[PDB]
Ligand binder design. Structure first.
Ligand SMILES: Cc1coc2ccc(-c3cc(Nc4cnccc4S(C)(=O)=O)cc4nccnc34)cc12
Ligand SMILES: O=P(O)(O)OC[C@H]1O[C@](O)(CO)[C@@H](O)[C@@H]1O
Length: 430
């Protein structure tokens, strides 16, 4: 005896264990880059995840950074402070996982000693949390130097000292950790832990005892990402006939303005002067027509097809409000989770866009020509926007969104190609 829920259209009867991810490694080995990127992916696929960076606890507890002397192993007092910052971060990890509905807590510190990791194990074991270790190993001076230049010298620790002095201070800071650093030893003393040791910026991996699906998924993700420079371009199909009529969904062709956009996109792409640009479309006509103007090879993906409005397909928003007034209201109230009847939600979109994201990570220069709701979902991933926000991100017609991975984030530049269109943006209601 069953009833269908109003928002998600789920039939209900009418009368999982959380994980602490423990980063491991010397400073400037990309621990925080990984922490952030992973946390972005996990949240976007609907696994609530949060980073606890001990460094930030240390920054909060102590006046202002003066020098690497603070990190000296003989600094008996800084050691007490560091350890207390760690325990405070863990206190917050407990609260996040046990009481705030967090699923994954990423404990982002050096955690270079067996003793420290042993304390974290004990903390996890006694709260029924699983523990999963990720160690980044790299002994290439160039990579380290570049890491320091790119994100360290610019940190708030170093505002009073810049450049040569910061670079110099950071190298000595690193050397403070070298003597007591005990790498993960899966061969022997760590043979029973679940871990991945990543070597040389993802060149090789050593993976030991994957316990569950999240961990195998993390490993798969780590095996697909890369740090080569590249650019990702996202846009919609040129304006189509249904856009002109205010009609949603469907498989209409480009308007005359849509075709002018396509010519302009072609011009824009040529002027970007890229090598080996891959082009991806949906299987819907308007995106394919748009790519046809480019005179480049392209590949279609059913996963990039626009959200399926179900019974509302090909209707105007007005027609939907007149015909299905309660469905209309429910969508405006809960736009991410709402499923159209016999159709999709934004939540469903994320599931089928996941392999698009994973292939995007593998690629270099890519242009993705897609549809409004799909574009928002992808944009949310790259820009770390939440589920509640995703459905309202702005992605105008005839506008290219040019994304450039930077460390810890993504530059976004909008480039409108000066071809008029209607506006299909609909802001949050009531
Ligand atoms: C790819 C990949 C898969 O697993 C990884 C683990 C670490 C890193 C990583 C990423 C990384 N990125 C990074 C770190 N700090 C500042 C800038 C960057 S970057 C290269 O601009 O994105 C630097 C690293 N340095 C030493 C070892 N690993 C680094 C990359 C990968
Ligand atoms: O989630 P929203 O704001 O209704 O936008 C998705 C709609 O946008 C369009 O791509 C253009 O109106 C429709 O095909 C689709 O139903």
């Amino acid at each position: 005896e069953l009833t269908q829920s109003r928002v998600q259209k789920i039939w209900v009867p009418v009368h999982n264990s959380p994980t602490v991810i423990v980063m491991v490694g010397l400073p400037a080995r990309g621990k925080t880059y990984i922490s952030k990127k992973l946390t972005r992916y996990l949240n976007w696929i609907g696994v609530p995840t949060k980073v606890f960076n001990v460094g930030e606890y240390r920054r909060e507890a102590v006046k202002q950074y003066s020098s690497y002397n603070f990190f000296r192993p003989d600094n008996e007092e800084a050691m007490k402070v560091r350890k207390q910052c760690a325990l405070a971060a863990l206190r917050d990890v407990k609260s996040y996982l046990a009481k705030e509905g967090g699923q994954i807590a990423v404990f982002d510190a050096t955690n270079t000693t067996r003793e420290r990791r042993h304390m974290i194990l004990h903390f996890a074991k006694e709260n029924d949390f699983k523990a999963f270790f990720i160690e980044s190993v790299c002994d290439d001076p160039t990579v380290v130097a570049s890491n320091i230049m790119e994100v360290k010298i610019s940190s708030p620790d170093y505002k009073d000292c810049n450049s040569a002095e910061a670079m110099d201070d950071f190298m000595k800071r690193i050397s403070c950790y070298e003597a007591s650093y005990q790498p993960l030893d899966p061969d022997k003393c760590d043979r029973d832990l679940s871990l991945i040791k990543v070597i040389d910026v993802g060149r090789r991996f050593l993976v030991n005892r994957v316990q569950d699906h999240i961990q195998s998924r993390i490993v798969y993700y780590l095996m697909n990402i890369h740090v080569q420079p590249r650019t990702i371009y996202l846009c919609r199909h040129g304006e189509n006939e249904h856009n002109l009529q205010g009609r949603i969904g469907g498989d209409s062709g480009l308007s005359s303005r849509g075709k002018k956009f396509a010519s302009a996109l072609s011009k824009f792409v040529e002027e970007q002067n890229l090598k080996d640009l891959r082009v991806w479309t949906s299987q819907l006509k308007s995106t394919i027509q748009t790519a046809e103007a480019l005179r480049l090879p392209y590949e279609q993906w059913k996963a990039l097809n626009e959200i399926d409005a179900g019974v509302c397909e090909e209707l105007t928003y007005e027609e939907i409000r007149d015909t299905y007034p309660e469905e209309y209201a429910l969508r405006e109230q809960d736009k991410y989770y709402y499923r159209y009847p016999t159709g999709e939600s934004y939540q469903d979109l994320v599931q089928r866009l996941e392999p698009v994201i994973m292939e995007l990570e593998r690629q270099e220069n890519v242009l993705v020509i897609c549809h409004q709701a799909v574009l928002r979902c992808l944009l949310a991933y790259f820009l770390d926007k939440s589920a509640e926000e995703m459905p309202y991100l702005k992605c105008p017609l005839h506008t290219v969104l040019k994304l450039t991975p930077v460390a810890y984030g993504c530059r976004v530049e909008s480039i409108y190609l000066n071809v008029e269109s209607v506006c299909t943006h609909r802001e949050r209601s009531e």
